[PDB]
Amino acid sequence: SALGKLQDVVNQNAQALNTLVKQLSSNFGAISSVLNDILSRLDPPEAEVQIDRLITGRLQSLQTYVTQQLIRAAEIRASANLAATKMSECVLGQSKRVDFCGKGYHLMSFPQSAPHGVVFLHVTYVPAQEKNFTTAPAICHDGKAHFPREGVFVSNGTHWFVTQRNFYEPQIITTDNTFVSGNCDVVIGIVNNTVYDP
Amino acid sequence: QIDRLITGRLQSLQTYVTQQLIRAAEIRASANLAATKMSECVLGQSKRVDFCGKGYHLMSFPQSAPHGVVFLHVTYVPAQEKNFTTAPAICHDGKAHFPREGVFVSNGTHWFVTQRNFYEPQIITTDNTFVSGNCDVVIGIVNNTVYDP
Amino acid sequence: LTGTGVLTESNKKFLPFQQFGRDIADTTDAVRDPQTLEILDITPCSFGGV
Amino acid sequence: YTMSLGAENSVAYSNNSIAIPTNFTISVTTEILPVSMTKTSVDCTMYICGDSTECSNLLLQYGSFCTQLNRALTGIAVEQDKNTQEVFAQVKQIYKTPPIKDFGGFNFSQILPDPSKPSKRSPIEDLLFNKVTNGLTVLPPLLTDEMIAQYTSALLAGTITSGWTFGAGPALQIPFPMQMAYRFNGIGVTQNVLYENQKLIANQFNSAIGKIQDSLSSTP
Amino acid sequence: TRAGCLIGAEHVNNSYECDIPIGAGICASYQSIIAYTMSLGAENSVAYSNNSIAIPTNFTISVTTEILPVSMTKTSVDCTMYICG
Numbered sequence: 001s002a003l004g005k006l007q008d009v010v011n012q013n014a015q016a017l018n019t020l021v022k023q024l025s026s027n028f029g030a031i032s033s034v035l036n037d038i039l040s041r042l043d044p045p046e047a048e049v050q051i052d053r054l055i056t057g058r059l060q061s062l063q064t065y066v067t068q069q070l071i072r073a074a075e076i077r078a079s080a081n082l083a084a085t086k087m088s089e090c091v092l093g094q095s096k097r098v099d100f101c102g103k104g105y106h107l108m109s110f111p112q113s114a115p116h117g118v119v120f121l122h123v124t125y126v127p128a129q130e131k132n133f134t135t136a137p138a139i140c141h142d143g144k145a146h147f148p149r150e151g152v153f154v155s156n157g158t159h160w161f162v163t164q165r166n167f168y169e170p171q172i173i174t175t176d177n178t179f180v181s182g183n184c185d186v187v188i189g190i191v192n193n194t195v196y197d198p
Numbered sequence: 199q200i201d202r203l204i205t206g207r208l209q210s211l212q213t214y215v216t217q218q219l220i221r222a223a224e225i226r227a228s229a230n231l232a233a234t235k236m237s238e239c240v241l242g243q244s245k246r247v248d249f250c251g252k253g254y255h256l257m258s259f260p261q262s263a264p265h266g267v268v269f270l271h272v273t274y275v276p277a278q279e280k281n282f283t284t285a286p287a288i289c290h291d292g293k294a295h296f297p298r299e300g301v302f303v304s305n306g307t308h309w310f311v312t313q314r315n316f317y318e319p320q321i322i323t324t325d326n327t328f329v330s331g332n333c334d335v336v337i338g339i340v341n342n343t344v345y346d347p
Numbered sequence: 348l349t350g351t352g353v354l355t356e357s358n359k360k361f362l363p364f365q366q367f368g369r370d371i372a373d374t375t376d377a378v379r380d381p382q383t384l385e386i387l388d389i390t391p392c393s394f395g396g397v
Numbered sequence: 398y399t400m401s402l403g404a405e406n407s408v409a410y411s412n413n414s415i416a417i418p419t420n421f422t423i424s425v426t427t428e429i430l431p432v433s434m435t436k437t438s439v440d441c442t443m444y445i446c447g448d449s450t451e452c453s454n455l456l457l458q459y460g461s462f463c464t465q466l467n468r469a470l471t472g473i474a475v476e477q478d479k480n481t482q483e484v485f486a487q488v489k490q491i492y493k494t495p496p497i498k499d500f501g502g503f504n505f506s507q508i509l510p511d512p513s514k515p516s517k518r519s520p521i522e523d524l525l526f527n528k529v530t531n532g533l534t535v536l537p538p539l540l541t542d543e544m545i546a547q548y549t550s551a552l553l554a555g556t557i558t559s560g561w562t563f564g565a566g567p568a569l570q571i572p573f574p575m576q577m578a579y580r581f582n583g584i585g586v587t588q589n590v591l592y593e594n595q596k597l598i599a600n601q602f603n604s605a606i607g608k609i610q611d612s613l614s615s616t617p
Numbered sequence: 618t619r620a621g622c623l624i625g626a627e628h629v630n631n632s633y634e635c636d637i638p639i640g641a642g643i644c645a646s647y648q649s650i651i652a653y654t655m656s657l658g659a660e661n662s663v664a665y666s667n668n669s670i671a672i673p674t675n676f677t678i679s680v681t682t683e684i685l686p687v688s689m690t691k692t693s694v695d696c697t698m699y700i701c702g
């Protein structure tokens with residue numbers, strides 16, 4: 001049941017065609033469902049009535065089929081527009097849109113052809129093996145508040161480090177990866193730690 | 199007589215099913231849009247303009263509604279703007295300095311560098327500027343000192 | 348008037364001239380029985396999808 | 398009258414002047430999107446004919462029209478449930494908020510579920526539910542209102558306690574001011590601005606959420 | 618059930634994932650056929666506190682499939698030949 005989405009479209013189209021042709025076997029209240037039988041068995045004054053009943057029944061069946069095909073074509077067009085958007089934004093580039101190109105942080109995507117369809121293999125980055133750390137919004141040093149330039153302040157219990165947000169890579173808190181804004185009296189939850197100067 | 203009633207009622211039922219399918223397509227499109235908003239505004243922060251509210255989108259909250267969803271978009275709107283005199287680059291020591299992340303502003307007498315979406319003036323230093331070329335190429339470069347820590 | 352349904356007691360205050368009642372579909376929903384003049388509610392027999 | 402398009406504003410453009418914001422407003426806006434319809438099923442034979450055997454015998458002369466209509470209505474009915482699954486059932490973990498609502502001044506009582514209500518809905522969701530009022534059958538939705546509210550509660554707990562981490566993998570806890578600072582960096586504003594003005598930002602957020610509830614309660 | 622009367626399926630008090638949807642929160646499965654209230658998911662209380670963060674120490678490169686239909690079978694019907702031969 002992996003490729004059920006394509007199979008449903010194929011089955012619906014084949015079933016619609018099958019039902020439309022099955023509608024020819026119905027007489028729609030006439031004496032027979034066959035036009036040739038009416039032409040060989042009856043005179044034209046009654047034959048016009050019988051073919052009129054068959055014509056209105058078959059025309060109603062064909063109009064119903066065309067309407068269903070138009071609605072399904074609109075649905076498939078919407079799906080194809082979505083697939084073209086995924087081809088542009090997941091395969092030809094890296095997308096920041098959450099869950100548009102797979103579950104997780106999207107890295108890349110690969111297109112594969114399928115019968116009346118496309119299969120996108122979304123290669124994504126999933127975080128794993130997370131660990132607790134004690135965190136602080138800012139570091140107080142020399143009466144100044146230090147904030148991380150790109151990472152986050154973490155503590156393993158005794159020492160404070162700065163690391164990137166999506167992977168644990170502890171580094172010494174220096175003046176190169178932090179910036180100074182204001183004193184320590186304003187930021188709620190600022191902790192005291194040294195800031196190394198290269 | 200029953201045939202006349204059957205054809206009338208069958209036409210009515212087919213008509214009802216036809217607009218039900220059209221409305222189903224419309225509701226399906228709206229639900230796909232709502233699922234996209236739930237994925238991109240609630241489960242992440244979206245850079246798409248006006249997709250998750252008016253303003254710079256911060257976060258979003260989903261709320262259930264009868265046959266629907268209500269998104270509370272929390273966005274950041276700039277306010278209390280102030281005029282400043284700006285320059286593309288700072289000329290110092292025969293070199294052109296450009297902001298790494300901010301913009302050069304002047305309150306009338308002194309030049310500073312600030313972030314683009316909030317006024318926070320800072321001293322123009324080498325830490326927040328980068329050097330590319332001399333002062334002869336950039337149109338509108340102004341003369342100001344660049345502090346060295 | 349022919350039909351199928353369950354005949355039950357009713358609390359509909361029919362006016363003296365009034366004999367039967369009709370729903371939106373125009374199908375009869377209540378009737379006044381002759382001979383005894385009582386008002387019987389007509390509720391369609393249980394049906395549904397299997 | 399001839400309708401106005403907008404208030405006229407002339408932008409003071411010049412080649413060497415810029416406008417820099419000195420303040421901000423935390424604005425909460427509502428967006429209402431329909432998800433599903435009422436699942437309706439129509440018995441084609443009963444609608445056209447009722448209990449008449451002769452009518453059904455004459456209806457069989459027209460073929461499989463009734464099967465087509467029932468199949469289309471069944472497809473619509475399952476499509477509504479699929480729509481509700483796609484919108485609300487995007488998490489396989491039911492996250493819960495901590496009992497202590499210490500989020501650094503941020504108040505979420507108007508959007509978190511109310512324990513006092515038997516429906517386990519938020520006050521905003523309760524107000525939203527209060528403000529919305531012959532062969533035919535109405536099928537109930539697969540997800541009831543309390544389970545949809547539970548899904549929204551799980552999404553709210555995930556986005557409050559974990560930010561966007563739960564949507565991309567395991568839910569990683571983070572303090573809410575730090576998460577807000579991350580969001581501030583996403584829109585290009587430094588963390589210091591959020592931390593220095595944290596009480597003001599929390600107050601503005603609470604005021605905006607209250608204004609949302611008042612606006613929903615005051616607009617028909 | 619709110620959806621209607623269910624005959625032949627035993628009702629259990631345990632909650633599982635939805636296998637066959639019945640309606641009104643009721644789903645059915647085979648294990649005899651059982652009927653149950655569908656479990657939305659596993660409970661996961663995130664250990665929130667005002668000064669603790671969770672940082673990933675590892676990662677998984679996950680590849681997922683997304684199947685999207687693009688086209689249908691191009692069918693043409695001769696209206697005169699269909700109705701009249």
Ligand SMILES: *[C@@H]1O[C@H](CO)[C@@H](O[C@@H]2O[C@H](CO)[C@@H](O)[C@H](O)[C@H]2NC(C)=O)[C@H](O)[C@H]1NC(C)=O
Nearest residue numbers: 133154155156157158159160161169170171172
């Ligand atoms: C937190 O991490 C730091 C850095 O990895 C640890 O400090 C080191 O600990 C080892 C183990 O005894 C020592 O050999 C090193 O000399 C330490 N380095 C420094 C610079 O002091 C620290 O022990 C960790 N703390 C905890 C509680 O795990």
Ligand SMILES: *[C@@H]1O[C@H](CO)[C@@H](O[C@@H]2O[C@H](CO)[C@@H](O)[C@H](O)[C@H]2NC(C)=O)[C@H](O)[C@H]1NC(C)=O
Nearest residue numbers: 140141142143144183184185189190191192193
């Ligand atoms: C972090 O360091 C600052 C200063 O080094 C500490 O602030 C001092 O606190 C004591 C007692 O509260 C006061 O008597 C001093 O006047 C404060 N000095 C300044 C400059 O503010 C602060 O308490 C330290 N915090 C922690 C958690 O160790």
Ligand SMILES: *[C@@H]1O[C@H](CO)[C@@H](O[C@@H]2O[C@H](CO)[C@@H](O)[C@H](O)[C@H]2NC(C)=O)[C@H](O)[C@H]1NC(C)=O
Nearest residue numbers: 282303304305306307308309310318319320321
């Ligand atoms: C532009 O801003 C700077 C910095 O805020 C102002 O410089 C300070 O002005 C105050 C008030 O006159 C003085 O007390 C300080 O000594 C000044 N600092 C320095 C380093 O000179 C400056 O006045 C502002 N200019 C205008 C026109 O508003």
Ligand SMILES: *[C@@H]1O[C@H](CO)[C@@H](O[C@@H]2O[C@H](CO)[C@@H](O)[C@H](O)[C@H]2NC(C)=O)[C@H](O)[C@H]1NC(C)=O
Nearest residue numbers: 289290291292293332333334338339340341342
């Ligand atoms: C900015 O500074 C530069 C150099 O300090 C100025 O360039 C000099 O301008 C004088 C006056 O026109 C000339 O005589 C020199 O030959 C120029 N030197 C160079 C290296 O170009 C420049 O005019 C200053 N601009 C402003 C607006 O003050």
Ligand SMILES: *[C@@H]1O[C@H](CO)[C@@H](O[C@@H]2O[C@H](CO)[C@@H](O)[C@H](O)[C@H]2NC(C)=O)[C@H](O)[C@H]1NC(C)=O
Nearest residue numbers: 278279280281282407408409410414415416417
């Ligand atoms: C920046 O300066 C410009 C011009 O000095 C200001 O633009 C004027 O604003 C007033 C007040 O509405 C209008 O009556 C004028 O017609 C505007 N002039 C032009 C040329 O547009 C502008 O308001 C200033 N910006 C701020 C934030 O004060």
Ligand SMILES: *[C@@H]1O[C@H](CO)[C@@H](O[C@@H]2O[C@H](CO)[C@@H](O)[C@H](O)[C@H]2NC(C)=O)[C@H](O)[C@H]1NC(C)=O
Nearest residue numbers: 277278419420421422423596597598600601604
């Ligand atoms: C930025 O705007 C906020 C309001 O959005 C200002 O906060 C108000 O400050 C005044 C006086 O300081 C108080 O009377 C109001 O009650 C405050 N309102 C709120 C909602 O807190 C804030 O002062 C502004 N800051 C700057 C620098 O302009």
Ligand SMILES: *[C@@H]1O[C@H](CO)[C@@H](O[C@@H]2O[C@H](CO)[C@@H](O)[C@H](O)[C@H]2NC(C)=O)[C@H](O)[C@H]1NC(C)=O
Nearest residue numbers: 498499500502503504505506507520603606607
């Ligand atoms: C969070 O917000 C709620 C509602 O906005 C606050 O509850 C109000 O508390 C005050 C005083 O306790 C009462 O007078 C109001 O009637 C309460 N409102 C409602 C709707 O119950 C609540 O105090 C805020 N703070 C916390 C920490 O929950």
Ligand SMILES: *[C@@H]1O[C@H](CO)[C@@H](O[C@@H]2O[C@H](CO)[C@@H](O)[C@H](O)[C@H]2NC(C)=O)[C@H](O)[C@H]1NC(C)=O
Nearest residue numbers: 129130131132133570662663664665669671672
């Ligand atoms: C971070 O610490 C918290 C609490 O110290 C951990 O949460 C507990 O995890 C155990 C293991 O399943 C549960 O039995 C407790 O009920 C949890 N407590 C709370 C309050 O949620 C959490 O697992 C730690 N995180 C990591 C990655 O180890």
Ligand SMILES: *[C@@H]1O[C@H](CO)[C@@H](O[C@@H]2O[C@H](CO)[C@@H](O)[C@H](O)[C@H]2NC(C)=O)[C@H](O)[C@H]1NC(C)=O
Nearest residue numbers: 126127128129130168673674675676677678679
């Ligand atoms: C991060 O996770 C990967 C697997 O997801 C770890 O790689 C495994 O390491 C163990 C022990 O070293 C081996 O027995 C396995 O064969 C490795 N698997 C693969 C696919 O290479 C890796 O060691 C983890 N890294 C850390 C630092 O924990």
Ligand SMILES: *[C@@H]1O[C@H](CO)[C@@H](O)[C@H](O)[C@H]1NC(C)=O
Nearest residue numbers: 188189190499501666667668
């Ligand atoms: C966190 O909460 C504890 C109480 O549980 C309090 O002592 C501490 O000051 C708080 N820290 C911050 C940064 O709010």
Ligand SMILES: *[C@@H]1O[C@H](CO)[C@@H](O)[C@H](O)[C@H]1NC(C)=O
Nearest residue numbers: 285286337338339411412413
């Ligand atoms: C801006 O226009 C003025 C004339 O109005 C001109 O003197 C000045 O050089 C221009 N600056 C730039 C950067 O184009």
Ligand SMILES: *[C@@H]1O[C@H](CO)[C@@H](O)[C@H](O)[C@H]1NC(C)=O
Nearest residue numbers: 366379380381382383384385
């Ligand atoms: C016969 O019907 C009349 C009303 O038409 C009623 O008044 C009378 O009581 C009935 N008599 C009997 C014996 O049912």
